[PDB]
From a paper:
Prolidases, also known as Xaa-Pro dipeptidases, are metalloproteases that catalyze the hydrolysis of dipeptides containing a C-terminal proline residue. Prolidases share a number of conserved sequence and structural features. These enzymes possess an N-terminal domain and a C-terminal catalytic domain, and form dimers through contact between both domains in a head-to-tail arrangement. The catalytic site features a binuclear metal cluster in the center of a pita-bread fold that is a canonical feature of this family of enzymes.
To better understand the potential significance of sequence conservation between the E. coli and human prolidases, we solved the structure of the bacterial enzyme at 2.0 Å resolution. The asymmetric unit contains a single PepQ dimer, which is the native oligomeric structure of this protein, arranged head-to-tail with inter-dimer contacts made between both domains. The active site of E. coli PepQ also features canonical metal binding residues, Asp246, Asp257, His339, Glu384 and Glu423, chelating two metal ions. Because PepQ was crystallized in buffer containing magnesium, the density found in this region is most likely derived from magnesium ions. Additionally, the mF0-DFc difference map shows greater density for one of the two metal ions (chelated by His339), consistent with reports from other pita-bread fold peptidases that this binding site has a higher affinity for metal ions. This observation suggests that the affinity for magnesium of either PepQ in general, or this site in particular, is not as high as seen for the preferred manganese ion in related proteins, reported to be in the low- or sub-micromolar range,,. Asp45, which reaches into the active site of one monomer from a loop region in the N-terminal domain of the other monomer, is seen in E. coli to be within interaction distance of Arg370, with the charged ends of the side chains approximately 3.5Å apart. PepQ Arg370, which is projected further into the active site on one of the loop regions conserved in prolidases from higher organisms, is placed far enough into the active site that it would physically impede the binding of longer peptides, as seen in the overlap between this arginine and the PepP-bound substrate tripeptide. PepQ R370 is, however, in an appropriate position for the guanidinium group of the arginine to interact with the C-terminus of the proline residue.
Residue numbers in the entry:
A (entry chain A), B (entry chain B): 3 to 443
Write the structure that this text describes.
Amino acid sequence: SLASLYKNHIATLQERTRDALARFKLDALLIHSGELFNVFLDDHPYPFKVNPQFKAWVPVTQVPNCWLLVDGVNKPKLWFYLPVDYWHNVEPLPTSFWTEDVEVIALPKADGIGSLLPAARGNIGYIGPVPERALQLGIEASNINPKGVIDYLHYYRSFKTEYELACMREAQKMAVNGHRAAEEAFRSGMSEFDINIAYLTATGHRDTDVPYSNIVALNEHAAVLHYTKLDHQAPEEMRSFLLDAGAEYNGYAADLTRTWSAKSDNDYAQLVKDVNDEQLALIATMKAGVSYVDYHIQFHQRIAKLLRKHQIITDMSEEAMVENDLTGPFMPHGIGHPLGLQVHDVAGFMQDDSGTHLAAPAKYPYLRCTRILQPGMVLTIEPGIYFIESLLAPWREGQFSKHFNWQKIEALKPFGGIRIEDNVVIHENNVENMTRDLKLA
Amino acid sequence: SLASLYKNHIATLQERTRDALARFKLDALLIHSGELFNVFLDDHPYPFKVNPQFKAWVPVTQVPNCWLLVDGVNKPKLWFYLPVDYWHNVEPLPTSFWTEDVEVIALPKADGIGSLLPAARGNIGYIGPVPERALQLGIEASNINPKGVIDYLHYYRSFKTEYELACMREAQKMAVNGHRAAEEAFRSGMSEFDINIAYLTATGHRDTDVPYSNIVALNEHAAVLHYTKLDHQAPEEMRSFLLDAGAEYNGYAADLTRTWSAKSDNDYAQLVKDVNDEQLALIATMKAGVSYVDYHIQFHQRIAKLLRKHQIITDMSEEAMVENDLTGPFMPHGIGHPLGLQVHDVAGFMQDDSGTHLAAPAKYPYLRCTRILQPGMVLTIEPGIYFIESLLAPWREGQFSKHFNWQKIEALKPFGGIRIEDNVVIHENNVENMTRDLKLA
Ligand SMILES: [Mg+2]
Ligand SMILES: [Mg+2]
Ligand SMILES: [Mg+2]
Ligand SMILES: [Mg+2]
């Protein structure tokens, strides 16, 4: 099943590659997995992060010095770095399903790749993180990471193959398990550090191989959007927990966010439940052929609803709240973004395979996606509401200050904020919510 | 007390810097903490690894875009990157023990540094991982990471101040706690992954912030010198555990290795005990004024003694065993190296402040230290005995094959290997074993 899906994946990628080579007048693409490099003045290596364009073809993510030659017609060729040394642990020559559709060739020495490459290299496009290596290998200067080919392929990354979707559902499983374990850790009164430990234990991940840094935010930290630190002692009293964490399977990411209240009978808990319901309703409105921006704006309308309902903003209609941008400081980020091999996946602004860029509207400058919904797309939906003094301050001084319930805002600050993130897949007649299909409350 | 020590530290570094600047004809050093950089084609950042030369002055290890300006006479100036935006964690400048000896100035934008630096930059030497940024700031290309100054400073990093020693002792405490918890995990039959969890829990480290990747090796994996993988299921039969792991405090590293046998009554357990005792005896022989190579060779003699005692190598004297290099494949690495801000600390081969280089002897090409011991040096002592087929097998094709007890070697291979590592401080008339002072058995 997964194997046959992978045969389709290879066929799709071969077609895209063939079209790209035809358009940009190239013979083939040489895709480099990457190389190790050390910290300044030290021999301490940075962790290896594989070229996304490399793992786009094959599930090999932990091996540098690998090389993929593709022409869209012949069987893809993979030179797989296989050093023989007693120092390091070395990955064996892979023989999994994918090796049936990809010709795997052992590469004992990294500098042995040059003699194995095609004789004529003048029309080969190199894609990889080491341009100097490409130049050494006889790749023409302009064929080193050519932006036209890269943009083309990125545009087509927007549309996931069935194999990719299967991989992403598998990542969803791991992330869900992690989130449940983390919630249990929170309920037990554990610190952010220990909660993180519980998440990693449940997922089988290390902090060095999660698709992105975990956000384990207790209380006020929930209002901190890029919170990546971990307190080693639990707060004096538990109030709230925002967890933005995910997982990875065959290079494909899940990226989930859940928010919990320590108590269930306060304003904050009610607000969390409301954000949940609004998120689900928004998703229920989603369909192909509609701009993603529409859904961003839509959630700002829902924010206006919640602000009015909870008496956070008073003496103003929801419509006027949106018109005057009062909802702006409460969700100062976008409703979400494409998801795939990368967490913030490529082509979020790209309208065609020629690289046409459509920026976010000035009113919502941090929106990461301006794409028309089409079947095959995988997108995050991550609405939130936060109470951030630096953003609220100018409002307190301005003409709309009287509309803000500063007392209640102060009362909500110690709870930080709320975000609820699912990952969905656009289909012809519906939207598949992978996260909720796994019943993550 | 740490404040007073730090004041002394500042005085020391000031004088070193003054002398270096006078010698290599510069007015000041501009030392850059570093910059974030992302994965190829992604917005996923690599973990931040501070410039060792930067944390050499101040205990700031997690903040990019910081700049130290030092002339060796006036109070050190530190522009501390302190951005004001509703993302990540917002807080004021540090007011810790070190902020009275250094002038700390908030830097809200990374590109604002250039207008805050002295106008005359023709004689300012840049030290940092971003030469391009130095060029942008008008630093002469020949003054970007100047070899003379860097080598000089590296040479003097060999001699730790009292502040540095204190920090290293704290790191020792952390690491010792980790090793104890890890041994306990091992005895309980836990997988490498769970043992690593236990280590991280006891030290309070993350995999992303350990000074070097943990080596958690069960059974045969102990024969793999750089084993940084983790099995998630415990092996069928527990036989051995080699743990090479450490900790960091104020940017200063501890690096410890311990080896345990599942059973206490077999040959392997006895060999582990013997290696431990021989390590301790070697350390008991250590003296200032003596070459480190002497101690490397000495431990090869001790290895010869053990191999003879255990009937692993037969019918050859210890002296002849060393002369013919039969002990070679049993410890294919150095006896140790300088330790400090970096794990493999600097100036290991550097004989003077002019950068004179003394290579390891050809017989022991992987020895990382050729220094004469002097008071204030911190060194690792990490002897080991391993059973590595790729290194042992060729001896069967040679004239000394008859001296190898291949049967016993075959019996010992399932246990992998043994390494016992302590971190020691050289003093005038004694050697301080920080690790054993903490009673890590
Ligand atoms: Mg997220
Ligand atoms: Mg997201
Ligand atoms: Mg060491
Ligand atoms: Mg070590």
